[PDB]
């Protein structure tokens, strides 16, 4: 749901969504981590659980619309930097 | 003071506006200027030639 | 288990030789050969190879022909002449490849069980684009979808050999470019080492576009292959790199500090000894 921005998820969340209490999101995620759906780890110093998500699937076209647009933010930023990058130094291209 | 600014004043007591941003995370504004700055050592390395 | 393959500079030269030797009076546009390998243990080599005569009528696309009494001869006589030198499979140009490639490879296997066929190019040569190769594979296709083929991509490299590489720096001399560049070739490796980037990133939304309007059928394959890129490039926010960034940033700023000092002396002295033996010859000229 939320595209890498901040995968820090905190406890509240997983327990509204999974509508699982507190003392059981710890084996939860544990359980995750054995299966082999999630590669991240558990901290809780603020109670809240780093995620890195390496179990990839299917999704819709609707995803894919966003997915191009960041493509297009991805095209446009690497082209522009490669503009100033043969502008600044093309006396010394050869 | 109270007509043109604020400071209004209340049950004794004056209100000032105040806030603050932050900014330690951009690594991004000196990566480019940076970038400049490295090129145009190198730029100058050579060229009198 | 093929990792990858390692074609020597000598058997594309003989592509290009019968590109050229079929160009006068064919109209074949496609140039189909026998290559010749030796599988050593797990990654592939190509030393040799030769040429086949093959044929292809567009109509029906589904006609081929083999010479294989030409094939027995010759792979035959290079076994006489090199006892080192085997089968590994075969080869096509064009990019554009033709459907009886399944037809070709599935006969020939009867010569070598891991067959493999690469991909040249012999037009195609602007851009950085190699030679490719892929394998033969036989499974039905996913999981619930129908049979097919689907010849799997294996990764090609280019190795040459002792005498190989160092007659290649005989041949070229035009640029020869030198080891370790003085920053003009290094900055142009970083030119067009990203010329190369956009160009498979414009490729990325070209099919992705011709996919997002829905004309070709999708393949789930790709969609999680491409999934894992976008969700594992790395994000810099705090104390992971702009603490670390600055570490080796601030590093190698305080040794190219010393170029800045020394440098100086150094022409400094070239300024002081051209200045006392000018005027020394200028004061005992007259």
């Known amino acids: 749901t939320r595209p890498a921005n901040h995968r820090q998820l905190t406890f509240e969340e997983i327990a509204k969504s999974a509508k699982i209490t507190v003392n059981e999101v710890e084996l939860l995620v544990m359980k995750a981590l054995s299966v082999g759906l999630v590669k991240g780890s558990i901290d809780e110093v603020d109670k809240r659980v780093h995620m890195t998500w390496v179990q990839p699937r299917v999704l819709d076209l609707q995803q894919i619309k966003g997915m191009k647009d960041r493509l297009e933010f991805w095209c446009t930023d690497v082209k522009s930097m490669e503009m100033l990058v043969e502008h600044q130094a093309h006396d010394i291209l050869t | 003071y109270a007509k043109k600014r604020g400071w209004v004043l209340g049950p004794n007591n004056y209100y000032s506006f105040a806030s603050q941003q932050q900014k330690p995370e951009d690594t991004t504004i000196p990566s480019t200027e940076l970038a400049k700055q490295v090129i145009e050592y190198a730029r100058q390395l050579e060229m009198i030639v | 288990a093929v990792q990858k393959v390692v074609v020597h500079p000598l058997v594309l030269l003989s592509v290009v030789d019968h590109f050229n030797r079929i160009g006068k009076v064919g109209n074949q546009k496609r140039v189909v050969g026998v290559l010749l390998g030796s599988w050593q243990k797990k990654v592939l080599d190509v030393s040799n190879s030769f040429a086949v005569p093959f044929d292809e009528d567009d109509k029906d696309d589904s006609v081929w022909f083999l010479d294989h009494d030409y094939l027995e001869n010759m792979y035959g006589m290079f076994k006489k002449v090199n006892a080192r030198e085997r089968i590994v499979g075969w080869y096509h140009t064009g990019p554009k490849l033709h459907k009886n ?49 689907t010849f799997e991509h294996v990764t090609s490299e280019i190795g040459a050999e002792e005498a190989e590489e160092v007659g290649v720096e005989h041949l070229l001399r035009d640029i020869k470019d030198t080891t370790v560049g003085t920053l003009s070739q290094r900055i142009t490796n970083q030119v067009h080492g990203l010329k ?13 576009e011709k996919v997002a309007t829905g004309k070709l059928p999708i393949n789930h394959q790709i969609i999680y292959q491409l999934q894992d890129v976008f969700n594992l490039l790395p994000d810099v926010s705090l104390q992971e790199f702009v603490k670390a960034f600055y570490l080796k940033t601030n590093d190698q700023m305080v040794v190219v500090y010393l170029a800045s000092l020394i440098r100086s002396v150094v022409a400094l002295h070239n300024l002081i000894n051209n200045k006392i033996a000018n005027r020394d010859a200028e004061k005992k000229e007259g």
């Open chain 3, 101 to 149: 490639d399944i037809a070709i490879n599935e006969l020939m296997k009867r010569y070598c069980p891991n067959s493999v066929l690469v991909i040249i190019d012999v037009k195609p040569k602007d851009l950085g684009l190699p030679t490719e190769a892929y394998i033969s594979v036989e499974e039905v296709h996913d999981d619930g979808t129908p049979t097919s083929k």
């Open chain 3, 196 to 208: 190369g980037l956009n160009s498979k990133l414009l490729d990325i939304r070209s099919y992705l």
